[PDB]
Each structure stands twice: as C-alpha cells, then as structure tokens.
C-alpha cells in the first residue's frame, strides 16, 4: 500500500552529518564496477551487437557509455 520515494541531494547542510550517506555518483559507479565482474559475460553481447550494427566508432562508444551505465537498473 504505502510508498515513499527518497528525495534528491537538494538540501545540503554543508558540514553536519549525513545519516546513511547514500551519495548517488560514487555508489552507482561502485554498483556498475561490481555488476561488470558478477555478470562479466553479458558485456560481450552488448559490445558485439553495437559493434556489428552501428557504422562509426563515435556512435558505438556513445551508446555503450550510456547502456553499460544503465544496465544495473535491471535484472
């Protein structure tokens, strides 16, 4: 029934404590670096379908930098 979304890093008392300190950037980079070692074979499918279908190194890199950062949002 009840749902409560956690709010963004808008309010920032600069030099007091931060409770659990769920700071999103370093947390999500750590999540991505864990995911690519646990699910290590799945990145081969992602790089190969992009490398085969897209017609430049620039557009291949552009989609992979996004997609491999999005990937741990799903299972």
């Amino acid at each position: 029934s009840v749902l409560i979304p956690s709010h963004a890093q808008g309010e920032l008392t600069g030099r007091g404590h931060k409770w659990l300190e769920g700071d999103s950037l370093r947390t999500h980079l750590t999540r991505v670096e864990g995911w690519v070692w646990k699910n290590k074979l799945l990145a081969l499918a992602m790089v190969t379908v992009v490398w085969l279908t897209l017609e430049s190194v620039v557009t291949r890199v552009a989609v992979l930098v996004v997609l491999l950062c999005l990937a741990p949002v799903y299972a």
Binding site: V2, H17, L20, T53, Y74, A75
Partner: protein
C-alpha cells in the same frame, strides 16, 4: 453436487468403451465426469499438505542492540583493540578518528577507534522458512455421486468419500454406496516442483495477515538480512541491520535500521498464500495428475416404475447455473421409490427430446431425490416433468460455446504449463505434437530469459524487432522478427 458451488468447473465425456479418464486436478478447480450410461461423479483435490515440515533458515526482521562499548588510540600508538571483538553475538567496526592537542594527543593526525555492540532478534520478529519432504506429503482427493438431492455449501453430504495419497500408494478403490466402486490412481511426483517451494512463516498470532506464503527458493536464499538455522544462539551477518556513525575523537554512534516487516510484506506482493492449522502446513496453490476408472460403477434405480405424471410441483423453478446448464427441483406426492419422466423440446417439433441430462436416470427416494441438472440448445424451449411445463429461453450460441471452451483451455495452458496436454478421456494425434512444441519452445524461453524482469523482457523483444527491421540480411531479419514476436507473446501471456 459440489461442482455447482464453484466458479471453475470442467466437463469430461466418453462412450461406453472408454472405461478410463485422465484428469489434472487443481486446488480451487473441479471436474464432472459424464461417460455414456455411467452414474456421473464430481471429483476435486481438497488439500496438499505435510505435518511438521523441516525448518530451513531463520531470518531476523528487527534487531535489538545493547551494551555498546568503544576504545580509541592516539596517532602513531597503533590499533585500538577490545575484548568484544572476539565473541559470538557482537557486531564491530574500526575506523580512523581525527586527533590533536584538543583531545589529549601529542601529535596532529589520524588515530584508531573501534566500537562494539551486542545483537539479537526482538521477541516475535523472526521469519522462518519451511521445506516439504516428498516421502511425507499427503494429497486428499474427494469424490461425490450425482444422487439427485441438493446439499448446500457449508453443510454435510452423506455420499462423499475421501482418499489420501502419499508416495506409498497405487490404485485405491472407493465404494460409492449403491452406485458401485470407483478406482483412482494419483502420481505423487511431478506437477508441483517440491524442491523449489518454501512455506514462509512470520507470526501466526497476528490477527490481520495470512499465516504463511508460498515463496520461491532462489529468492529466499538471497534475502540480505541477519540469519541462522534452528537451535543456534548467534546470528550470522548481523552487520546488515547495525549502521555506524561517522567517528568523533573518542566516541562513535551505533544506529539501528529498525523493523523491516513492512519491506518484506511489500516485496512478497504477487506470491500465493499458504495456510497453517495446528501441525498441518497446507499449500493453497498447485495440482496433481490422476487416472480414474469407471468400470465398476452401477446405475441406481433402472428397475423402478414411472411416477404419476399429474402429481409433481416445483420447489426451485428452472434457473441458470452460470455453467451453460439449467438447474431445477421438484416435489412429488405419489408412491415411492419411482422414476421422474423429464424431457425438453424446441418449438420446431414436440416429438424430439433435446435434454442432455447431467443427472442420469433421476428418481424420487423414500426420503430424498427430486433435483435435476441439464444442458439445452440455443433458442426457445419447453421443459416437461410429467404435466409440469415451463418455458426457457437459452442464452448464447453454438459459436459462443466453441469460444468459451477454447478460452478456458488457454487458462489451463498459462496456469499449468505442459500438464495441460494430459487433460482428457481419449487420445488424438495433435496432442503428441502440442506437448513436443510446448516443452521445446517453452523450454528454450525458460532457459534463455526465464528470471528476467517483465519490462526488460518487453524492451528486449522490442529491440529484437528493431534489429529485425534495421539489419540488412533478410534471413536474420525474418528470424529476429519471428523470435521477437514469440518472446513478446510468451511475456505478455504471463503479465505483471
């Protein structure tokens, strides 16, 4: 006739020479068997259970913390060390606090601090998992004859017989009274996969929750909470519910993440319920396959005389069952026992009886009888019981009947999987193809994509269709379009 009380009811049919029927029986389902010239029977699965299943893990939902202690050292004076680091039932963390002249240190820099706290579960705040043993499971199957008397739900019918199946059984035989003997065989293996189910228990004394849940085993072993097995006094992974404050010079706070009960009850949304009753742990989900043999069943009352056509009156007037059948009840004042002269006609000819009775050879007994169920064709009809006459406009159409019987077959296929092909009184060639295609293609989907989330499955299916449109090779293009369609259809066929 218990099948009239339930929203799900399947009808099965056969000629004199059929002798045996294969059924899949489901909790909350029901079957009526209508073989040529045999007394009709209602059959259902009433319970799947074990007494006292074995405990797997226990998990703690609300940490109790107590007796905290802290110790700290000046810069260059080595690590801080404390006795409670080397005990059962304690959680500890060590960190480097800032130090200097202002907190009685000789040097300005980073010291060492350790904080310790005891950990336990609050008095009723456990989750316990239970698992079944295939040697001890009881399946209960019940059979009821169409005796032509009506006993309601929530009262007792004298004609019901019960059979309890466990791994040590073959064909049982039940004496259905004067209607003779029914022979019944249960396969106690297959259908439900007992290696993959955990019956989860929280607290049976809480007034406003189910007593148990049918959770999946691969999910239950990945719960990120403190845990143990039975009889141990210490909790593994207790650092999952303590969290530690940032360090001060000579103090460090211990914080509790609180009662997790609400997060678990939200995570369980979409898991079937289960029920606990003294020593018994019931599933309320799943199925069994049976073969039922009709050969020794006896028609009652074939030797009796006809009723006086003039002496009937209605007790329940003809009413729609909701199962495409007409239900009625009559009262009689003549000599007993005797046979009820029941028939129905279309307006197009009075000589042709069109009543397909479900109750075969209906009778009045010295102390019962008088209920009839029948199926009538579409259109405008008259129902006769001697001199009683009643008009009836039968709803629906022949094409509508073909649709509803097709639709309920799709419900079996999505709810039951490959066992859907075993439901029937006779063989036919396309059933051998159907099981092969289902076990191959459903096996491929469940192998390659099984545990993947619903939205990710749709996104992958749409991406496969997009690759099918955009990739230049025509054989690969068509293969991606076909396989993407199959992945989307099977995904949408289970939903979220």
């Amino acid at each position: 006739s218990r099948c009239t009380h339930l929203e799900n009811r399947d009808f099965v049919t056969g000629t004199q020479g059929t002798t045996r029927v294969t059924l899949v029986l489901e909790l909350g389902g029901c079957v009526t068997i209508t073989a040529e010239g045999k007394p009709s029977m209602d059959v259902w699965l009433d319970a799947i259970y074990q007494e006292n299943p074995a405990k797997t893990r226990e998990y703690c939902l609300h940490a109790k913390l107590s007796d905290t202690k802290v110790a700290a050292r000046c810069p260059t004076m080595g690590p801080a060390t404390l006795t409670e680091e080397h005990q059962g039932g304690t959680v500890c963390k060590r960190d480097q606090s800032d130090r200097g002249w202002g907190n009685h240190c000789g040097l300005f820099g980073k010291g060492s601090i350790v904080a310790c706290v005891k950990a336990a579960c609050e008095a009723k705040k456990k989750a316990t998992g239970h698992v079944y043993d295939a040697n001890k499971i009881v399946y209960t199957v019940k059979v009821e004859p169409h005796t032509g008397d009506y006993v309601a739900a929530n009262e007792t019918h004298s004609g019901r017989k019960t059979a309890s199946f466990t791994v040590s059984s073959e064909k049982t035989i039940l004496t259905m009274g004067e209607y003779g003997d029914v022979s019944l065989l249960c396969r106690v293996a297959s259908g439900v996969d007992l290696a993959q189910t955990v019956i989860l228990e929280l607290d049976k004394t809480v007034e406003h929750l189910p007593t148990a849940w049918q959770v999946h085993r691969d999910w239950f072993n990945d719960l990120a909470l403190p845990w143990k097995h039975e009889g141990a006094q210490n909790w593994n992974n207790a650092e999952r519910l303590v969290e530690f404050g940032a360090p001060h010079a000579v103090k460090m706070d211990v914080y509790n993440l609180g009662d997790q009960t609400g997060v678990l009850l939200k995570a369980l949304a979409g898991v079937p319920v289960a029920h606990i009753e003294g020593t018994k742990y019931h599933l309320k989900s799943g199925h069994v396959t049976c073969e039922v043999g009709l050969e020794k069943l006896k028609m009652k009352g074939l030797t009796y005389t006809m009723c006086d056509k003039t002496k009937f009156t209605w007790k329940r007037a003809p009413t729609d069952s909701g199962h495409d059948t007409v239900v009625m009840e009559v009262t009689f004042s003549g000599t007993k026992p005797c046979r009820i002269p029941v028939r129905a006609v279309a307006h197009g000819s009075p000589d042709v009886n069109v009543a397909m009775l479900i109750t075969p050879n209906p009778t009045i007994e010295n102390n019962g009888g008088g209920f009839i169920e029948m199926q009538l064709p579409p259109g405008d009809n008259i129902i006769y019981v001697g001199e009683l006459s009643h008009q009836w406009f039968q709803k629906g159409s022949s094409i509508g009947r073909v649709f509803q019987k097709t639709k309920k077959g799709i419900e079996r296929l999505t709810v039951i999987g490959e066992h859907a092909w075993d439901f029937g009184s006779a063989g036919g060639f396309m059933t051998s193809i159907g099981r092969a295609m289902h076990t191959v293609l459903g096996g491929a989907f469940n192998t390659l994509l099984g545990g993947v989330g619903f939205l990710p499955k749709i996104l992958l299916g749409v991406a496969m269709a997009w690759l099918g449109l955009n990739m230049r090779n025509p054989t690969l293009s068509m293969g991606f379009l076909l396989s993407g369609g199959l992945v989307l259809a099977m995904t949408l066929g289970v939903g979220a």
